[PDB]
mmCIF file of all heavy atoms in Angstrom:
data_model
loop_
_atom_site.group_PDB
_atom_site.id
_atom_site.type_symbol
_atom_site.label_atom_id
_atom_site.label_comp_id
_atom_site.label_asym_id
_atom_site.label_seq_id
_atom_site.Cartn_x
_atom_site.Cartn_y
_atom_site.Cartn_z
ATOM 1 N N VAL A 405 -11.984 18.587 27.235
ATOM 2 C CA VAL A 405 -11.555 19.865 26.763
ATOM 3 C C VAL A 405 -12.218 20.092 25.369
ATOM 4 O O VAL A 405 -12.246 19.119 24.560
ATOM 5 C CB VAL A 405 -10.085 20.026 26.591
ATOM 6 C CG1 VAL A 405 -9.636 21.477 26.374
ATOM 7 C CG2 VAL A 405 -9.376 19.427 27.782
ATOM 8 N N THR A 406 -12.710 21.246 25.162
ATOM 9 C CA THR A 406 -13.285 21.615 23.870
ATOM 10 C C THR A 406 -12.160 21.701 22.862
ATOM 11 O O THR A 406 -10.952 21.751 23.149
ATOM 12 C CB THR A 406 -14.080 22.919 23.862
ATOM 13 O OG1 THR A 406 -13.236 23.945 24.295
ATOM 14 C CG2 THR A 406 -15.215 22.785 24.802
ATOM 15 N N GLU A 407 -12.557 21.839 21.606
ATOM 16 C CA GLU A 407 -11.632 22.140 20.523
ATOM 17 C C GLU A 407 -11.495 23.628 20.586
ATOM 18 O O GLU A 407 -12.318 24.367 21.098
ATOM 19 C CB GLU A 407 -12.198 21.676 19.172
ATOM 20 C CG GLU A 407 -12.343 20.162 19.221
ATOM 21 C CD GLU A 407 -11.018 19.336 19.218
ATOM 22 O OE1 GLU A 407 -9.919 19.931 19.054
ATOM 23 O OE2 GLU A 407 -11.102 18.138 19.451
ATOM 24 N N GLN A 408 -10.367 24.081 20.024
ATOM 25 C CA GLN A 408 -10.094 25.525 20.039
ATOM 26 C C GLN A 408 -11.224 26.233 19.265
ATOM 27 O O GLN A 408 -11.563 25.886 18.154
ATOM 28 C CB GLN A 408 -8.776 25.796 19.370
ATOM 29 C CG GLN A 408 -8.266 27.199 19.691
ATOM 30 C CD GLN A 408 -6.915 27.406 19.120
ATOM 31 O OE1 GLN A 408 -6.497 26.816 18.102
ATOM 32 N NE2 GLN A 408 -6.129 28.278 19.781
ATOM 33 N N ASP A 409 -11.770 27.267 19.867
ATOM 34 C CA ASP A 409 -12.887 28.041 19.258
ATOM 35 C C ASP A 409 -12.460 28.730 17.984
ATOM 36 O O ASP A 409 -11.513 29.458 17.928
ATOM 37 C CB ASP A 409 -13.391 29.078 20.215
ATOM 38 C CG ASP A 409 -14.627 29.794 19.713
ATOM 39 O OD1 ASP A 409 -15.694 29.140 19.823
ATOM 40 O OD2 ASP A 409 -14.519 30.932 19.210
ATOM 41 N N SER A 410 -13.324 28.586 16.920
ATOM 42 C CA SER A 410 -12.954 29.022 15.546
ATOM 43 C C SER A 410 -12.978 30.526 15.440
ATOM 44 O O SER A 410 -12.610 31.048 14.418
ATOM 45 C CB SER A 410 -13.927 28.395 14.597
ATOM 46 O OG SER A 410 -15.208 28.827 14.875
ATOM 47 N N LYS A 411 -13.533 31.280 16.465
ATOM 48 C CA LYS A 411 -13.537 32.673 16.490
ATOM 49 C C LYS A 411 -12.571 33.388 17.414
ATOM 50 O O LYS A 411 -11.795 34.240 16.986
ATOM 51 C CB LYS A 411 -14.943 33.189 16.747
ATOM 52 C CG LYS A 411 -15.844 32.954 15.514
ATOM 53 C CD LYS A 411 -17.331 32.690 15.846
ATOM 54 C CE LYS A 411 -18.169 32.824 14.658
ATOM 55 N NZ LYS A 411 -19.597 32.648 14.996
ATOM 56 N N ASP A 412 -12.523 32.985 18.729
ATOM 57 C CA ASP A 412 -11.678 33.638 19.713
ATOM 58 C C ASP A 412 -10.421 32.804 20.028
ATOM 59 O O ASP A 412 -9.584 33.298 20.836
ATOM 60 C CB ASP A 412 -12.486 34.025 20.995
ATOM 61 C CG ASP A 412 -12.961 32.839 21.784
ATOM 62 O OD1 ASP A 412 -12.391 31.759 21.774
ATOM 63 O OD2 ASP A 412 -13.951 32.969 22.587
ATOM 64 N N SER A 413 -10.323 31.535 19.553
ATOM 65 C CA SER A 413 -9.150 30.743 19.648
ATOM 66 C C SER A 413 -8.829 30.318 21.141
ATOM 67 O O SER A 413 -7.679 29.981 21.523
ATOM 68 C CB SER A 413 -7.900 31.460 19.069
ATOM 69 O OG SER A 413 -8.126 31.721 17.696
ATOM 70 N N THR A 414 -9.851 30.306 21.987
ATOM 71 C CA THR A 414 -9.762 29.822 23.337
ATOM 72 C C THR A 414 -10.317 28.371 23.482
ATOM 73 O O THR A 414 -10.999 27.824 22.552
ATOM 74 C CB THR A 414 -10.601 30.734 24.313
ATOM 75 O OG1 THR A 414 -11.960 30.698 23.946
ATOM 76 C CG2 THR A 414 -10.117 32.159 24.304
ATOM 77 N N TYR A 415 -10.055 27.842 24.661
ATOM 78 C CA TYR A 415 -10.533 26.517 25.068
ATOM 79 C C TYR A 415 -11.412 26.668 26.256
ATOM 80 O O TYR A 415 -11.376 27.701 26.982
ATOM 81 C CB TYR A 415 -9.339 25.678 25.517
ATOM 82 C CG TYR A 415 -8.382 25.351 24.384
ATOM 83 C CD1 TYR A 415 -7.211 26.133 24.178
ATOM 84 C CD2 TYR A 415 -8.575 24.252 23.538
ATOM 85 C CE1 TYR A 415 -6.322 25.829 23.123
ATOM 86 C CE2 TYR A 415 -7.665 24.001 22.454
ATOM 87 C CZ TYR A 415 -6.556 24.802 22.286
ATOM 88 O OH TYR A 415 -5.622 24.507 21.377
ATOM 89 N N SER A 416 -12.268 25.682 26.525
ATOM 90 C CA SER A 416 -12.874 25.440 27.788
ATOM 91 C C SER A 416 -12.668 23.962 28.217
ATOM 92 O O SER A 416 -12.382 23.144 27.405
ATOM 93 C CB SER A 416 -14.344 25.811 27.675
ATOM 94 O OG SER A 416 -14.574 27.188 27.429
ATOM 95 N N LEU A 417 -12.753 23.730 29.532
ATOM 96 C CA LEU A 417 -12.379 22.429 30.089
ATOM 97 C C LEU A 417 -13.302 22.154 31.292
ATOM 98 O O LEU A 417 -13.549 23.106 32.049
ATOM 99 C CB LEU A 417 -10.893 22.476 30.524
ATOM 100 C CG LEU A 417 -10.292 21.169 31.230
ATOM 101 C CD1 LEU A 417 -8.842 21.118 30.949
ATOM 102 C CD2 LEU A 417 -10.540 21.158 32.712
ATOM 103 N N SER A 418 -13.708 20.862 31.395
ATOM 104 C CA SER A 418 -14.476 20.382 32.532
ATOM 105 C C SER A 418 -13.606 19.310 33.216
ATOM 106 O O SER A 418 -12.916 18.593 32.562
ATOM 107 C CB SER A 418 -15.801 19.721 32.073
ATOM 108 O OG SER A 418 -15.457 18.472 31.341
ATOM 109 N N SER A 419 -13.629 19.311 34.542
ATOM 110 C CA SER A 419 -13.111 18.240 35.331
ATOM 111 C C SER A 419 -14.292 17.758 36.250
ATOM 112 O O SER A 419 -14.992 18.597 36.853
ATOM 113 C CB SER A 419 -11.880 18.661 36.210
ATOM 114 O OG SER A 419 -11.473 17.615 37.052
ATOM 115 N N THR A 420 -14.443 16.484 36.285
ATOM 116 C CA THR A 420 -15.513 15.828 37.002
ATOM 117 C C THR A 420 -14.974 14.932 38.028
ATOM 118 O O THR A 420 -14.196 14.044 37.719
ATOM 119 C CB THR A 420 -16.482 15.101 36.041
ATOM 120 O OG1 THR A 420 -16.937 16.021 35.046
ATOM 121 C CG2 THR A 420 -17.645 14.571 36.790
ATOM 122 N N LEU A 421 -15.297 15.104 39.279
ATOM 123 C CA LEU A 421 -14.921 14.302 40.355
ATOM 124 C C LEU A 421 -16.043 13.393 40.736
ATOM 125 O O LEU A 421 -17.182 13.919 40.920
ATOM 126 C CB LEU A 421 -14.600 15.212 41.590
ATOM 127 C CG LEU A 421 -14.225 14.579 42.928
ATOM 128 C CD1 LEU A 421 -12.839 13.815 42.771
ATOM 129 C CD2 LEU A 421 -14.240 15.480 44.067
ATOM 130 N N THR A 422 -15.785 12.052 40.750
ATOM 131 C CA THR A 422 -16.851 11.091 41.030
ATOM 132 C C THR A 422 -16.626 10.482 42.343
ATOM 133 O O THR A 422 -15.469 10.009 42.612
ATOM 134 C CB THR A 422 -16.876 10.012 39.960
ATOM 135 O OG1 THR A 422 -17.130 10.608 38.720
ATOM 136 C CG2 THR A 422 -17.997 8.972 40.187
ATOM 137 N N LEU A 423 -17.635 10.550 43.228
ATOM 138 C CA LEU A 423 -17.570 10.005 44.634
ATOM 139 C C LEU A 423 -18.827 9.173 44.882
ATOM 140 O O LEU A 423 -19.827 9.428 44.221
ATOM 141 C CB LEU A 423 -17.599 11.148 45.698
ATOM 142 C CG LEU A 423 -16.430 12.040 45.766
ATOM 143 C CD1 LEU A 423 -16.606 12.967 46.894
ATOM 144 C CD2 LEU A 423 -15.095 11.377 45.958
ATOM 145 N N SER A 424 -18.728 8.230 45.766
ATOM 146 C CA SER A 424 -19.956 7.502 46.225
ATOM 147 C C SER A 424 -20.724 8.517 47.109
ATOM 148 O O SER A 424 -20.109 9.432 47.693
ATOM 149 C CB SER A 424 -19.624 6.241 47.002
ATOM 150 O OG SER A 424 -18.969 6.619 48.200
ATOM 151 N N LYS A 425 -22.022 8.341 47.140
ATOM 152 C CA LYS A 425 -22.808 9.159 48.104
ATOM 153 C C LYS A 425 -22.263 9.122 49.519
ATOM 154 O O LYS A 425 -22.305 10.145 50.131
ATOM 155 C CB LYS A 425 -24.281 8.652 48.016
ATOM 156 C CG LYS A 425 -25.265 9.465 48.856
ATOM 157 C CD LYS A 425 -26.626 8.801 48.822
ATOM 158 C CE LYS A 425 -27.685 9.690 49.526
ATOM 159 N NZ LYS A 425 -27.560 9.507 50.992
ATOM 160 N N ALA A 426 -21.980 7.908 49.996
ATOM 161 C CA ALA A 426 -21.478 7.755 51.355
ATOM 162 C C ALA A 426 -20.181 8.579 51.561
ATOM 163 O O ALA A 426 -20.199 9.327 52.589
ATOM 164 C CB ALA A 426 -21.191 6.206 51.595
#
Side-chain angles (χ1 to χ4, degrees):
Chain A
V405 194
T406 59
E407 299 289 351
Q408 193 175 34
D409 186 78
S410 62
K411 287 147 168 189
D412 69 24
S413 300
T414 61
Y415 296 95
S416 294
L417 178 152
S418 67
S419 176
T420 305
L421 175 69
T422 300
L423 297 181
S424 65
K425 180 185 186 284

